[PDB]
Symmetry: C3
Subunit: 259 residues, 3 copies
Amino acid sequence: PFCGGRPEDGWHHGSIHDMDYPLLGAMAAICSVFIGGSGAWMLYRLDLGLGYSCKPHHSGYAPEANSFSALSCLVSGTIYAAKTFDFFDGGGTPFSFNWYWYLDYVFTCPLILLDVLYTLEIPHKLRFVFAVIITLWCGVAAFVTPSAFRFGYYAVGCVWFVPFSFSLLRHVKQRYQVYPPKCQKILFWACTIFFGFWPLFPILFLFSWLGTGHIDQQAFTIIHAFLDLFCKTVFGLIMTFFRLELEEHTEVLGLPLNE
Amino acid sequence: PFCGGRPEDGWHHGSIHDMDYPLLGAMAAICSVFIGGSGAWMLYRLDLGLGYSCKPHHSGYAPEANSFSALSCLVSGTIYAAKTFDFFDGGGTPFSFNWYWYLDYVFTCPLILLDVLYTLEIPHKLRFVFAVIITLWCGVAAFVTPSAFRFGYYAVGCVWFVPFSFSLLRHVKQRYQVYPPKCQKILFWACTIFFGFWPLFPILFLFSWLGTGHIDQQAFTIIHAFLDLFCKTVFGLIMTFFRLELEEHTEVLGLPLNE
Amino acid sequence: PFCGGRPEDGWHHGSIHDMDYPLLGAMAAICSVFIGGSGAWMLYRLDLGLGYSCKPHHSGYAPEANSFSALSCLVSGTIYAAKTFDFFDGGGTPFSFNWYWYLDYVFTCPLILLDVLYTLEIPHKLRFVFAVIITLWCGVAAFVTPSAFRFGYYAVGCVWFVPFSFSLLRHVKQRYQVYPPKCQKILFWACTIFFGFWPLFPILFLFSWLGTGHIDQQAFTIIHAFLDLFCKTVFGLIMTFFRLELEEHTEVLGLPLNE
Ligand code: NA
Ligand code: NA
Ligand code: NA
Ligand code: NA
Ligand code: NA
Ligand code: NA
Ligand code: NA
Ligand code: NA
Ligand code: NA
Ligand code: NA
Ligand code: NA
Ligand code: NA
Ligand code: NA
Ligand code: NA
Ligand code: NA
Ligand code: NA
Ligand code: NA
Ligand code: NA
Ligand code: NA
Ligand code: NA
Ligand code: NA
Ligand code: NA
Ligand code: NA
Ligand code: NA
Ligand code: NA
Ligand code: NA
Ligand code: NA
Ligand code: NA
Ligand code: NA
Ligand code: NA
Ligand code: NA
Ligand code: NA
Ligand code: NA
Ligand code: NA
Ligand code: NA
Ligand code: NA
Ligand code: NA
Ligand code: NA
Ligand code: NA
Ligand code: NA
Ligand code: NA
Ligand code: NA
Ligand code: NA
Ligand code: NA
Ligand code: NA
Ligand code: NA
Ligand code: NA
Ligand code: NA
């Protein structure tokens, strides 16, 4: 996908790519080990057994759709390792997961969403996943367009995200009442990261260098790194503990859900 | 995927890209609203209920594989919005869904096919989808190759499409007889768009600027826009009404299919 | 994905791309017909019926996940046809499946793996497929990086492959004992190509022009062509005959597996 990165004299001072790459690479390395390591603990804990009491799994193995939290974190930790490699080489390298904004999210956010859809038994899974993929590609396109048609790609994703988010909130509110009081407490916090932090990504674009010019690319990277520590690892850990409490109630104690 | 689009003085007169972009953008905008709006009505009508009498769905929600018609139309309307943005910027923009011919079809045509495969309960779904993806990438490659090896990529897709189409016609003829007389009437017309219009795409290449030079890129765009109004929206609407009649017979009236 | 291929004066003598393209194209043509033709025989034989006695399939059609061997071979034969077209045009063509090393494997190796996972009824299918995709993209990135950070991408894939391969070996050893003596003999040989040849790909990188400089790009292509004749076609044929013997025991003779 690339045709031109770092110039031979280095980045020109005044470019959006003239950043502190040693600092950014350090932050990406911390994120890599944190997010990827959280996904590895998550995988380990899945295989340990069912709830908090670790009841042996029914088939002997973990359900396949219980792994999306772990996988999103393990894939994002790998993407952050690629990012540290680019930042430590000074930017603009042939394989850069830093260059195209939101491309890394095309591969990670569908998995975070699948985690919710499967854990909460949400209908219209295909419609929801397709929606999110469309939206993320509109963001990729908005960052790549050098004209005011970047606001057209931005608005097309908003036309896909506003319906998606309202439909999902409705569905998750319906499911919330089925859950036991202890699992509803964990879910509250997952819903505040999924529906409270997901809308911030679009607003940050509006204040960026491709918007009002308040947030530069270096600051945008730091903000997104912190947002990914919450929207990937904290989210996945909350979702793992929701499932452990769910299955401690439903599988280990055999009690029922409040339909 | 891009390395060079519009020159700074504009397109050179005599290039394949020297077209009437204001007119093409207008046509793409009409297509966007028409195809995307048809996909939105389709989604609405899916959720309304089962047949023409709108019987409540069994699970409360629509079956997941009943949404492929709507999704193909909604995705193509979004791709046509991206196309209007490129045409209104004058062509050759970093994110151009106009530049690489048949790339938009790599993402939309598998969904049109899945709609048929699932609605008509066709076997070998993986083989058929894989086949179509291969073929479309051979077309992408044929448009990108500047030599006579473009006819080798073209012929490799023909080696994948001729078997696919004959195998699918056999399968759809077998399924046709299971359906009731009223649903067979709607299906006739779907089969004439799927098996009558799908083969025209390869013939148009042979008369294009990469073939005999009768059809330029501007005319090729207009032809494909009209073909997409029939192969996406008219097809999906016929497929929706086939399903409404099917389920009015089988679900609402509880009558059986003629095995 | 491309921005620059063959120069107008041709490749410079001393480039990694100054190779014997007429010879390489001939080898790719042989591979195309061999691998693709093996996938076509495999498809034919799937549809013939169940075991060696060709018992009619239960649904009338072959199970969908019995086709991954055929599909991997048919897709690799098509990729090798694209490769012959590039080699016969002299290299560096816009659509080159030769340029980016291991990109062709991103599309073929997941299907070889799915064949094993489904045939041997292996758990954690998503985890295994995701793992392999990650690893192959790290290899794509290692071949594209011009610095010593190529060894960082290489090592990140090794961190994904070593766990994958050990976990799969454990799982396949568990499944091996369920199978009858005759099917265990065929499986031995499949396991020697899957677990004996798969690790050679990483070692070849270390001796390549991006490693110690013993293996040039021309020799690397020939080695990989031979490796693909074994890891695609020989593997798929062994897997087909394992399934025919399995189903001759379990379906045709109705005998049971040794749990
Ligand atoms: Na940069
Ligand atoms: Na998990
Ligand atoms: Na998750
Ligand atoms: Na960069
Ligand atoms: Na990128
Ligand atoms: Na970025
Ligand atoms: Na960045
Ligand atoms: Na970044
Ligand atoms: Na950038
Ligand atoms: Na960008
Ligand atoms: Na990004
Ligand atoms: Na990115
Ligand atoms: Na949630
Ligand atoms: Na970042
Ligand atoms: Na996560
Ligand atoms: Na859990
Ligand atoms: Na153009
Ligand atoms: Na629909
Ligand atoms: Na359709
Ligand atoms: Na264009
Ligand atoms: Na394009
Ligand atoms: Na086009
Ligand atoms: Na065009
Ligand atoms: Na076009
Ligand atoms: Na073009
Ligand atoms: Na093209
Ligand atoms: Na096109
Ligand atoms: Na296109
Ligand atoms: Na049809
Ligand atoms: Na068009
Ligand atoms: Na459609
Ligand atoms: Na319908
Ligand atoms: Na070359
Ligand atoms: Na097969
Ligand atoms: Na295989
Ligand atoms: Na080449
Ligand atoms: Na390539
Ligand atoms: Na290659
Ligand atoms: Na090569
Ligand atoms: Na090659
Ligand atoms: Na190369
Ligand atoms: Na390469
Ligand atoms: Na390769
Ligand atoms: Na390749
Ligand atoms: Na094996
Ligand atoms: Na090769
Ligand atoms: Na194979
Ligand atoms: Na078989």
